[PDB]
Amino acid sequence: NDCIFEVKHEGKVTGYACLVGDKVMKPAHVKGTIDNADLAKLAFKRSSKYDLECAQIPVHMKSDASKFTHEKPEGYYNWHHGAVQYSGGRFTIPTGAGKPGDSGRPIFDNKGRVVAIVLGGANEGARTALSVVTWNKDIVTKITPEGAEEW
Amino acid sequence: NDCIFEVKHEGKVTGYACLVGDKVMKPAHVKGTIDNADLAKLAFKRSSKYDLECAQIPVHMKSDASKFTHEKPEGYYNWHHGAVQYSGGRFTIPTGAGKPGDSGRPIFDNKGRVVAIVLGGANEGARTALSVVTWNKDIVTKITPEGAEEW
Numbered sequence: 001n002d003c004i005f006e007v008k009h010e011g012k013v014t015g016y017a018c019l020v021g022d023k024v025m026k027p028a029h030v031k032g033t034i035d036n037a038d039l040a041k042l043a044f045k046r047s048s049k050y051d052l053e054c055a056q057i058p059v060h061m062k063s064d065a066s067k068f069t070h071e072k073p074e075g076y077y078n079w080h081h082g083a084v085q086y087s088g089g090r091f092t093i094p095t096g097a098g099k100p101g102d103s104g105r106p107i108f109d110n111k112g113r114v115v116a117i118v119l120g121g122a123n124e125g126a127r128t129a130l131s132v133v134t135w136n137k138d139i140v141t142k143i144t145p146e147g148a149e150e151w
Numbered sequence: 152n153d154c155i156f157e158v159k160h161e162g163k164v165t166g167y168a169c170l171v172g173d174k175v176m177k178p179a180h181v182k183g184t185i186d187n188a189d190l191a192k193l194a195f196k197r198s199s200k201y202d203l204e205c206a207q208i209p210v211h212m213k214s215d216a217s218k219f220t221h222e223k224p225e226g227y228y229n230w231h232h233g234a235v236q237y238s239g240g241r242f243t244i245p246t247g248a249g250k251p252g253d254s255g256r257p258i259f260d261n262k263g264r265v266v267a268i269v270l271g272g273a274n275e276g277a278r279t280a281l282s283v284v285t286w287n288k289d290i291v292t293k294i295t296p297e298g299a300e301e302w
Contacts, residue, residue, distance in 0.1 A: 021239060058297030063278040067239060 003112060005064040006104070007036045015103025015151065020114050025054040026121050027103050029150055050142045051119055066106065067113035067139040070137040077115060080105045084130070090145060091116065091130040094108055096123075102151040107132070122148040152229060152263050153283050156215050157256075159186045166302070167255030170208055171265055172214035177204040178255050178270055200255050201293045202270055202301065203211045217257065217266040221286045228266065229259040235283070241296065242267060242281040248265075254302035258283070271301035 006016040010032025017026035017034055024039055028051045034040045042055040057065055074087045084107060085092045091107065098121060107116040120131035122145040129145035156170045161183030166176035168185060175190060185191040193206040202207040208216055228235045232248035235258055242258065249272055264284045267285040273296050280296035 019233060059273050059280075059296070060298075061275060062273075063275040120262075 004106075004108075006106070007034050007039065007067065011035065013077060013101035015105075017099060017104060018106050018114075019057055020106065020117075021065055021068045022062070023054050023056055024144060025052060027051055027117070027150075028053045029119070030103050037100075047124065050131055050133055050140055052117075052140060052142075066108075067111075068135075069109065069113045069115060070135055071109070072115055072134065077107045077109055079107045079118065089143065090116065090127075091118075091132050091143070093121065093124045093128045093130065096125075097128075098151065100149075100151050116143075118151065120148050120150040122146065152259070154217075154263055155231075155257070155259070157218055158190060160184060162186050164252040166252065167283055169257045169265065170266065171214075171218060171219050171257070173208055173213055175206045175208055176268065178202055178268075178301070179204050180253060180270075185235070201289075201291060202282075203293075217259075219286065220260060220262075220264050220266060221288055222249075223259065223285065226261070228261070229263075230269070231256050237266075242283050242294070243278045244272075244281065246276050246279050249302065250280060251302045269302070270295075271294055271299050273297060273299040 006018045008014055010017055012134055014032050015027055015030040028046050044055045056106050070120055075081040076083045077086055081097050105118045106114045109115055116132040116134040118132055122129045131144045131148045133140055133142050158168050160181050165183050166178055168246055173174055179197050179281055195204045195206045196253035197204045225238050234245050234248050236243050255262040256269045258267045260266050267283045269283055270281055271282040273280045282299040284293050
């Protein structure tokens, strides 16, 4: 299950930066720098519309990069705090299961490949939706419910 | 499944060459010439776009050649050092199976036909990435990751 690699920033619960396929990626809104000197010296690219910051993974360590897919059938997917629901396109936690600091967590399917990265969410109890990024095979896209806040 | 035919260069650990379909194929970066004199006297074409060399198989020995396919689904594959895999659009092995001197080996599918040829790689323990040649529909191509070296 926990067959996973990621790293945090500046010695706080500053969210995570994640090795997906062939590149390191991170929320653009989370502060500081990576708590791994091997990745910290990389030259990151960024977008303030996807809220995404990214760099190529160095050749000597690509075994640590997680599998990825665009494929998102409806059902349930898994992250740091266990299962999360996906139906009507709203990645949803059944009440309160996350809070600020819960940034950058990948969402993995039932075959252990990444579909999305978490950024934040919007409270409506059992209907609590997530702000995320996910790739439509060629291109990254940002999902965001109305009334969200960042994590 | 040992239903394979090959030849080596200058009678030493100098890489390898294959009988595929109706043509010999060989790497361009390997030193010396083919061990078998009935192959070695033939006229060879070459390309630095693919690090590759080729010739027509003599009709008396064409019956000894291996079969091929363009197919590359995700999964596991056969070659002389074992443990070879295709995933994320990449061929891979664990490190111990591949090194300098082992270039020119064919990779076979689960039905015993060649899909690709090993030229070299970029090392890591669990998943070393490979430089290879392979056919797409009915045209040859080269695949090569970041930071690889020929063997």
